[PDB]
Structure formats: C-alpha cells, structure tokens
RNA sequence: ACCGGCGGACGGCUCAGUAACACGUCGGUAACCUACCCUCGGGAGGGGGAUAACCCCGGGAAACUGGGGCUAAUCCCCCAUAGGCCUGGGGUACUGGAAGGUCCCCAGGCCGAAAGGGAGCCGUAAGGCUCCGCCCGAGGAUGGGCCGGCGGCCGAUUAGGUAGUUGGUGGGGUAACGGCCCACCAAGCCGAAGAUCGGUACGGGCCGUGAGAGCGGGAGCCCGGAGAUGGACACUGAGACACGGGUCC
C-alpha cells in the first residue's frame, strides 16, 4: 500500500508530491473525507520542501484521491467500496453536454490500500 | 463574326449593365472569349477592366451563338459581387 | 419518425399561388412566419430574383437585400424569408418603383405598378376586435398587424371594415365600412381578383361563414365569402386594382 | 334563448352542467337527425341514422346504419324510438361525442 | 410512467395492438396527495412547452370566502368529508370537492390544490 | 482552444410492425402547447456568486479523471416592481351562431423578468445618432396534439365476445377533453347488415391492362404514418423518451 500524497498550499497555489510506503500508511487509511490530520503525525520535512514557515499547528485535510485503475474517489459515496453509479455532475464526471448523464465508476470517502493517490490541503 | 445586341438592361441595385447579344459566324468556329470581349468593349465603349462575359453558348446546327455579359461601374463592386471562378475564367484574376 | 417542426420545403409541394418552376430544382425557400398566411404569401427572395430579375443567384440577391435597398410597406426588410402578402406595397426607393401585391384571376400573386402617392397607403381589413389591459380596444388586421384605440372610439370600427393606414408611421387615414353598395375586391376563392359592389349579406346557423353577393361593373351578380370580400372604397375604389 | 339552432328550447330547465341549453356545454360542428334505439344507460342514448350508399360497379344502392351515442340531458328525456336531433360537442366520455338538443317527435 | 394514451380495448370488446411506442407528450404524473400539516409545502414542476405548475403537497392555511367577497386566511383543522374518495376524509386529503373545518366553520373547497398551489373554499351558512 | 448562444427533434435511409381515427376527405378544439418570425402598448432599478481557459501537482494501458490558486461574461443566484394562476362578490364594455372566454371594480392568496449588454460614428466632457440586441402583455403566423361523420381486404371447416368492460357522481393527472387513472353507484356495450378470433398488408395521389364496365399492383417521385439489433426506461430542451446523445435486460 504505497500512497502518493499531493499536498497543496492554498496560501500560495503550489502543490507538491511525496511517496509513502508503509508504517504511516495505516494512520491515513480509514479516514473519511472532511477530517484533518496533524502534519507531524506522518510528516516528512514539509519545511524545506516548500521553503516556508508553516506554523506548528499545520494540519493536513483529506480532499480527495484516486484509485489504482484511474478511478476517482467521490467525496459522497459511503464506505471503502467501488461502485458503478449514474452521475450528472461532480467529481468523476465531465458532462460535455447540457443534461447528459453517463454512468461512471467511483470510490468512497474512506481511504483503502487500493487507493494510490491522496490529495490533501494544508490547513493553518 | 458579327455581334448584334439584342437586349441592354441597366441594373443599379448592383452597379452594372447586363448585355444579351448574338454572334453570327457561319463557317467559322465559336469565337474566343478574348475576341468577344474585345469586340464588345470596342463597340459599346466600355471599360475592359470592369466587364465580364457570363457565357458564350453555341447551339446545335446554327450559325448564331448566344452570349450574355455584364459591365460594372466599379472594379471594387465587380470583385465584391462576381464569383471568383468566372473572374478567373475571364482572366481578370491571375489566380 | 417526425419529432418536431419542419425546416425544409420541396419545390413540388410549394404553394400553388407562387410563380415558380416546380421541377427546375429540388428545394424551395420555406417561408418564415410573418404577417400573412403561407397560402397568400411569397418569400422576398423570389420577388427579388425571379419576379423582377434584379438578381441571378440567391447569393447576390441576399447581398442586395442586406444593403436595405428593398422596402416592404414602409420598413426596410433584410430577411430573404420574409413573407409578403395581398395588399402589400413593395417599394424600391433607389429606382422609384412601387408595386402592389395582388392575386390574379387564377389565384397567383402578381406585382401591379402603382404611383408614388399611392405607395404610402396600405389598406387593412379588421379581422378581429378585442379588449386589452386598461379598457382599450385592439384591432387585429388581415396581415396579423395590431392597432390600439381608446374606448371612446369603440363604435368607429367593426369587424370586416377596412382601415386606410399611412405607413410606416402607422396613422389612421380613414375607415371604410362594410354595408350595402360598398366597393369590394375578392382576394380568394373561385371569384378571386374580381371587383364589384356589395348587394346582400346572408347568415347561417352554426359556424358556417356568412356569404355576400357582389355586383360587377357589367351588372352580373356573383357570390363569395364575407371574409373573402375586401373593402377598398365607398362607391369607387380608392386604390388602383387592375 | 338560442345556441345557433333554429329549434325551440326545452320547455323545462335542468341543472346538468353538460346541457347546452341550461349548462356550460357548447355545441359545434355536425348536426344529425336520428331515431333512438336504446336508452338504458343513465343520461345516455344511442342514435341510429339510416342512409343509402351507392355502388358504382353494380349501379345500385345499399342500406347502411350509423350508430352514435349521445348525452341525454334531464330536460330532454329522449326515450326509445323517438326522433331526435344531435349536435357534435367535446368528448364527454370514451364513446359519447354528441348531445341531444331537441326531440322532433315522440314515439 | 403514468401513460394517459388510448385504451387497449375497443368499445365492442376486442383488443388493440399498439402500432408505435409511447410518446413523451402522453405521460402523466403521480397524484399530489395534499395533506393537512403545520406548514405549507409546495414544489415547482416544469410542464409541456416550458410552462410552470405549482404543486401543493402539504397545506396549512386556506382562503375562505363567505357569500360577500370578503376573504380570510384561516387554518385547516381536519377534513370532515371528501366525497371524491371514502378514505380521503379519514386520511386528511384535500381535493376540489372536500369539506374542511376551520375556526370559522365548515368550508367547501373550490380550487385544485394539486394544480393551483393554494386552497380556496366557501363557507357553509 | 476554452466558457457562452443557437442548431444538432429538419434533412438522409427502410416498410419490419400496424385491419387502426394508421390513411383519404369534410368539419370541430368555446377542451390545448408552440423555440424561430411580424405588429402594437410597456420596462430594463439594486446587489451577490462561483467556475472554464490559465498556473502547480498528477494517475490510468487505455477509455477517462482527482486536488489547490486565479479569474470574465448576453454564465448563474437573490431583492424590488411590473407581471402570471386560483377562488369569491359585483358592471355588462368585446369577438362570436352561441361565452366555463376577453374587459372594468373590490377581497384572500401562491408564483414571479430582464443583457441599457455589444459594435460603429461623433462629441473636450456631458450627451447625441445608427446597427444588431434583452424582458413582460395582447394578437398573428409556422409547426403540432387531440376529437367527430363518411370511405377503402379475405375466412362460418371462426358464433357468441366484453368485466375498466358500457354509462353516471365526485376527484387526480395532463398543455388540453376523455375510464387516461382513482373511489362509489347500476348492467350496461358489441354481434349473422358477420362481434371476437385467424390470414395478409404501410394508407393515398397514382401505375399496368382493357373499347368501356372492370380486373390486378400500390418499392423508386410527392403528402401522411412507423423504425433505428429485439424490448423497457428516463435527463436537457419550445419541440425526443432522440439513427451518427444516455441507462438496464
Ligand atoms: Zn337542460
């Protein structure tokens, strides 16, 4: 279960990627979308990486993620399960028409070992 | 070949005059567009650069070839109104 | 298989009142909705190209139209699908030509030349009368146009009357009533393009239309529909209808 | 009053909203004369019209019948065999599209 | 959905085989069972041609008129009787023929709450 | 290239299904919808909101697609008024063959607009003119929905069929009337003048043949109806349950 964490700083509009293999993967696993995680919980530098002075109270907010097979994680489907659903808008669907509704594949809030990317936002 | 003008019309919504004519030419081939235009301009005292020949139609078993042409007051209006292919055929546009 | 409005019109199915070759080509101009019906109308493109010959192709006809060189009634029209119908004035100010659109004896529309003074008058038959907000009377004419008057002039206008209206300013010139001896011109039916004077009016039960008898200049009596009878004068025609 | 027909209105009044004489119903279209064949259903009557159809090939006529179901307003209580006049109206039921407007003669 | 097209049986009694699929213009909608509640609940429906309909699902007030044009906005307590159905009165369902009770007395409904968006009634003297 | 507006529901193809108001014709809608276009009488006041493109980081084999920053509009939302819809009490001004219609005055409520935006010429500025524009009301026009009378095929070795079936009283739903659907009342409705059932078939203008009566066909062109591998469903839109859009078997 190797996670690619994309940390985005809203105060500067800059995002950077890191790779985490194990041990601290479990701490992120199981958390839904909408809950913060302290940076030091599994931090790797994060200071010289961004060249800034983030306060000690910096936290990581789980915004989204993507599965192995290019399947996005919807912030609304409950549970760590993959399901086929009919969408009109929102993450995982790009209408391209006026009222088109195409059935797509999405995941749920909770992270699972299958998830490959976790996108997170920095909270001050 | 003798050219006889059968009809002259003055269109001013489009700045042109329409000329319907006939060419009597027994025993001779259909006159060329260059020659027809030259004789027409010589006879009518028109501007060579603002006149086009829509068509020169030769009928079957006849010594009379019908012809339709137009003469424009301004070359700009001529270019704006007339299609490109007919101007190329008449040679006004180098293409 | 049909799901919505049609946008095409084959030449073989064009209205019988047009002057068009029904087999030279495959497609005809589908008239855009406008003042008059499709049966008594013709797209302005055919008038510009075929009737008058000012143009040889639809492209140059559109180029002429876009410059506002053609006037219908008193307004400049640029849409080549605009319908023009009976008792309409087509004016070309650059040429001084003024035509009145009228049906001939076979029901086809033709252009009758008229004078410059006549070019500013367009008769309108009052097709209906109703009331609108504020207690005003609205008159709806045969060409779909509408006019508004106060309740004071309520009795000055009635259905089947004619109104002479200056254009494009839309001023009321005079009102020609529909009674005995009123000069009328038939715009539809077997007796199309025939003129005369009213003689008698007959009504029937149910929605069957009323029938009016007309006497022609030769003294002969014929009949037509009261809606087909178009008033053009009191004792003699106030407009030229030859 | 009058509703476009040159017939005498019924001598009595009724509260049926579907009666063109004393209700909001409007009659428009065809008018037929016929003989009532059956009146068992409530406020309903079947009207039979008799006409001849010409056969070109055999140059002869045949007898044909046209059957129509019409509303029977309480004021105009048409019975079996009566000669009635019916007028077209809006669809009143699955098969009722006519209304009896007068009784020309009792049976 | 609720198809409101032609019947499947001839008046004689025979059956009819459809020659075409159902069209979008022949479809209806579920009944709007307007119920007595503590607050008014309504929704907006887009209909054929882009028109709008206001559908009342829960009704709390009623506009009551009394033989003189005077109108009062009062509260609906219960449905005394609804001849349109033998159980609408029991279930407190309001329709065009319902008889409701208000603080002023008995009122007969005269509007269509499923099509109007409001409940109007006339007092019984 | 992206947002945004319009169009893609027409045109093109085929004759499966369909014996039916599918088609032809004559009439109704006073029981109804209509984007584009025409005319007349009016209006355009005050605020707010994101997000595409773009920049940073990506994944997936692909098909596709996630997070963060940033912004504009004829994009979207809200407030006001004008305006729509229902109902009740009054006046009868209008079209109609006839008003459950239209108009005027009171009463209770629900719903509820806009882009003074763009271009050109001027004008020191202000402001002006022209072109193409936006919103509401009343009508037209175009394109439709629905309904009625009449007309057009064979079998008796197919004689009884129907049970939401026929009609009503009250409602729901529909853009609209309707057993279209619901609750309650009755037993009605069709049929040897051939119901029901079965066979075949897109209907018509027309084409072939014959002196004509008539007989047979009705693929190519036009109008109308259906279908998009066989079925069933829905979103956006004025218009579809949509051939080159969507969901399931
Ligand atoms: Zn009565």
UniProtKB/Swiss-Prot annotation, chain A:
HAMAP family: Ribosomal_eS6 (MF_00512). Part of the 30S ribosomal subunit. This is Small ribosomal subunit protein eS6. The keyword Repressor does not apply. Transmembrane segments: none annotated. GO terms for molecular function: structural constituent of ribosome. Belongs to the eukaryotic ribosomal protein eS6 family. It comes from Pyrococcus furiosus (strain ATCC 43587 / DSM 3638 / JCM 8422 / Vc1). Keywords: Ribonucleoprotein, Ribosomal protein. GO terms for biological process: translation. It holds the Pfam family Ribosomal_S6e. Residues 89-108 are annotated as: Disordered. The gene is rps6e. GO terms for cellular component: ribonucleoprotein complex; ribosome.
UniProtKB/Swiss-Prot annotation, chain C:
It comes from the Archaea. Residues 42-104 form the S4 RNA-binding domain. This is Small ribosomal subunit protein eS4. The keyword S-adenosyl-L-methionine does not apply. One of its GO terms (molecular function) is rRNA binding. It comes from Pyrococcus furiosus (strain ATCC 43587 / DSM 3638 / JCM 8422 / Vc1). Part of the 30S ribosomal subunit. GO terms for cellular component: cytosolic small ribosomal subunit. The keyword Ribonucleoprotein applies. Transmembrane segments: none annotated. Pfam families: Ribosomal_S4e, RS4NT, S4. The gene is rps4e.
Swiss-Prot record, chain D:
PROSITE patterns: RIBOSOMAL_S17. One of its GO terms (molecular function) is structural constituent of ribosome. GO terms for cellular component: cytosolic small ribosomal subunit. It comes from the Archaea. Pfam families: Ribosomal_S17. GO terms for biological process: translation. The keyword Ribonucleoprotein applies. Keywords: Ribonucleoprotein, Ribosomal protein, RNA-binding, rRNA-binding. The keyword Nucleotide-binding does not apply. PANTHER family: 40S RIBOSOMAL PROTEIN S11 FAMILY MEMBER, 40S RIBOSOMAL PROTEIN S11-RELATED. Belongs to the universal ribosomal protein uS17 family. Part of the 30S ribosomal subunit. HAMAP family: Ribosomal_uS17_A. One of the primary rRNA binding proteins, it binds specifically to the 5'-end of 16S ribosomal RNA. This is Small ribosomal subunit protein uS17. It comes from Pyrococcus furiosus (strain ATCC 43587 / DSM 3638 / JCM 8422 / Vc1). The lineage of its organism: Archaea, Methanobacteriati, Methanobacteriota, Thermococci, Thermococcales.
From Swiss-Prot, chain E:
It comes from the Archaea. Keywords: Ribonucleoprotein, Ribosomal protein. One of its GO terms (cellular component) is ribosome. GO terms for molecular function: structural constituent of ribosome. GO terms for biological process: translation. Belongs to the eukaryotic ribosomal protein eS8 family. Part of the 30S ribosomal subunit. This is Small ribosomal subunit protein eS8. It comes from Pyrococcus furiosus (strain ATCC 43587 / DSM 3638 / JCM 8422 / Vc1).
């Amino acid at each position: 279960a190797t996670f690619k964490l994309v940390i985005s700083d809203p105060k500067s509009g800059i995002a950077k990627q890191v790779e985490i293999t194990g041990a601290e993967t479990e701490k992120l696993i199981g958390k839904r979308i909408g809950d913060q995680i302290p940076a030091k919980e599994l931090n790797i530098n994060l200071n010289e990486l961004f060249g800034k002075e983030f306060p000690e109270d910096v936290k990581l907010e789980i915004r989204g993620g993507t599965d192995k097979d290019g399947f996005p994680m919807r912030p609304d489907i409950h549970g760590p399960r993959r399901v086929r659903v009919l969408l009109s808008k929102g993450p995982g669907f790009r209408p391209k028409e006026k009222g088109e509704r195409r059935k797509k594949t999405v995941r749920g809030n909770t992270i699972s070992p299958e998830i490959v990317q976790v996108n997170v936002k920095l909270v001050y | 070949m003798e050219i006889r003008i059968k009809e002259i019309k003055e269109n001013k919504l489009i700045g042109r005059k329409e000329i319907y004519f006939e060419i009597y030419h027994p025993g001779e081939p259909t006159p060329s567009r260059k020659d027809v235009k030259g004789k027409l301009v010589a006879m009518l005292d028109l501007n060579p650069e603002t006149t086009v020949i829509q068509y020169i139609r030769s009928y079957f078993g006849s010594y009379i070839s019908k012809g339709y042409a137009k003469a424009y007051d301004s070359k700009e209006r001529m270019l704006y109104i007339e299609p490109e292919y007919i101007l190329i055929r008449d040679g006004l546009i180098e293409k | 298989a049909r799901k919505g409005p049609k946008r095409h019109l084959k030449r073989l199915a064009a209205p019988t009142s047009w002057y068009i070759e029904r087999k030279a080509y495959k497609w005809a101009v589908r008239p855009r909705p406008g003042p008059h019906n499709m049966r008594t109308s013709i797209p302005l493109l055919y008038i510009v190209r075929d009737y008058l010959g000012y143009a040889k192709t639809a492209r140059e006809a559109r180029k002429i139209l876009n410059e506002g060189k053609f006037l219908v009634d008193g307004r400049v029209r640029k849409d080549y699908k605009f319908p023009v119908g009976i008792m309409d004035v087509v004016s070309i100010p650059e040429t001084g030509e003024h035509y009145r659109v009228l049906p001939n004896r076979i029901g086809k529309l033709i252009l009758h030349p008229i004078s410059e003074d006549e070019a500013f008058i367009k008769p309108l038959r009052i097709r209906n009368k109703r009331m609108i907000k504020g207690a005003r009377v609205q008159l709806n004419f045969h060409d779909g146009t509408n006019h508004i008057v106060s309740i004071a002039e309520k009795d000055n206008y009635f259905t089947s009357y004619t109104v002479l209206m200056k254009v494009p300013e839309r001023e009321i010139l005079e009102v020609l009533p529909f009674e005995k001896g009123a000069y009328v011109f038939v715009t539809q039916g077997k007796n199309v393009a025939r003129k005369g004077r009213i003689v008698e009016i007959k009504r029937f039960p149910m929605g069957w239309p009323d029938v009016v008898t007309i006497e022609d200049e030769e003294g002969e009596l014929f009949d037509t529909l009261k809606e087909y009878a178009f008033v053009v004068g009191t004792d003699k025609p106030k407009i030229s209808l030859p | 009053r009058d509703i476009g027909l040159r017939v005498q209105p019924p001598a009595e009044k009724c509260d049926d909203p579907k009666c063109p004489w004393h209700g909001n119903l409007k009659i428009h279209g065809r008018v037929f004369e016929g003989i009532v064949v059956s009146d068992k259903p409530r406020k309903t009557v079947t009207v039979e019209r008799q006409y001849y159809f010409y056969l070109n090939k055999y140059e002869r006529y045949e007898l044909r019948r046209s059957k129509i179901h019409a509303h029977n307003p309480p004021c105009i209580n048409a019975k079996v065999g009566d000669k009635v006049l019916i007028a077209e109206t809006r669809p009143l039921s699955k098969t009722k599209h006519f209304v009896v407007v007068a009784v020309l003669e009792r049976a | 959905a609720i198809w409101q097209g032609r019947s499947l049986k001839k008046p004689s009694g025979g059956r009819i085989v459809l020659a075409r699929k159902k069209r979008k213009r022949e479809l209806g909608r579920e009944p709007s069972n307007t119920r007595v509640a503590e607050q008014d609940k309504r929704k907006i429906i887009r209909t054929y041609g882009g028109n709008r309909k206001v559908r009342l699902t829960a009704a709390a007030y009623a506009n009551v008129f009394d033989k003189s044009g005077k109108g009062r906005k009062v509260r609906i307590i219960r449905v005394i009787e609804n001849p349109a159905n033998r159980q609408f009165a029991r279930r407190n369902i309001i329709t065009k023929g319902a008889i409701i009770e208000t603080e002023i007395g008995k009122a007969k409904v005269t509007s269509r709450p499923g099509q109007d968006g409001v409940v109007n009634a006339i007092l019984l003297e």
